[PDB]
Design a protein around this ligand. Structure first.
Ligand code: NAP
Ligand code: GQO
Ligand code: BR
Ligand code: BR
Ligand code: BR
Ligand code: BR
Length: 166
């Protein structure tokens, strides 16, 4: 439960075991169960994304429905119809509940304010490569539960972590 006067900042991402979350401006796998999970967590809340993550969303679909979409960019004239564009992270974090939904740069910026991380680990052995977007590594202040590996319908194995801190 979030009191309406507070500011709960959460991060939600899917990563390969290695930490890779993005490559060539795309997520380098597809996992429908994780798409559904991402919706269940974020629906009804503000979502904050960096400009490159906005670009990675299909044009017809963005802004993602049922959520207040916020795009972080330093480009004053950036066009993101249906979203709002802000030039600093702190300006993006005024709602009672906010989910930061990527990418690599914006997770790293937001982590100091965050008290929840909802992580999907994908059992794909993509090694970290030059130019990849990477997930944060959570330090010892973060704690929580680790789910069991399961086969998705597609065959790709995954497990869910729900972590938090004070
Ligand atoms: N697997 C997952 O869960 C997941 C989720 C989301 C995204 N992704 C992937 O991650 C990749 C994108 O990540 P990324 O790290 O390259 O980019 P990003 O974090 O999505 O976006 C970076 C952009 O955000 C803006 N920005 C960054 N810091 C800022 C600040 N302090 N103030 C204002 N604006 C700021 C800048 O926009 P301007 O250049 O316009 O100024 C910057 O170029 C893609 O491959 C995407 O598909 C993966
Ligand atoms: C489902 C991926 C995902 N999962 C987790 N757990 N956290 C994230 N932040 C997260 O990213 C959501 C925002 C980026 O979405 C992208 C980006 C590039 C390529 C594909 C997708 C999937 C979009 S979607 O299928 O879910 N949809 C139509 C909006
Ligand atoms: Br990338
Ligand atoms: Br996906
Ligand atoms: Br959607
Ligand atoms: Br499937």
């Amino acid at each position: 439960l979030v009191p309406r006067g507070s500011h709960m900042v959460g991060l939600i991402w899917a990563q390969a075991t290695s930490g890779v979350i993005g490559r060539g401006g795309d997520i380098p796998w597809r996992l429908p169960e994780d798409q559904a999970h991402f919706r269940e967590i974020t629906m009804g809340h503000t979502i904050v994304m960096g400009r490159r993550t906005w670009d990675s969303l299909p044009a017809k679909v963005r802004p993602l429905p049922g959520r207040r979409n916020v795009v972080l960019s330093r480009q004053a004239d950036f066009m993101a119809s249906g979203a709002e564009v802000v030039g600093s992270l702190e300006e993006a974090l005024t709602s009672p509940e906010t989910w930061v939904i990527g990418g690599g740069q914006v997770y790293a910026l937001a982590l100091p304010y965050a008290t929840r991380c909802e992580v999907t680990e994908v059992d794909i052995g993509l090694p970290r490569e030059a130019g990849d977007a990477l997930a944060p590594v959570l330090d010892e202040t973060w704690r929580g539960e680790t789910g069991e590996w399961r086969f998705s319908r597609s065959g790709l194995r995954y497990r869910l972590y729900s972590y938090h801190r004070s």
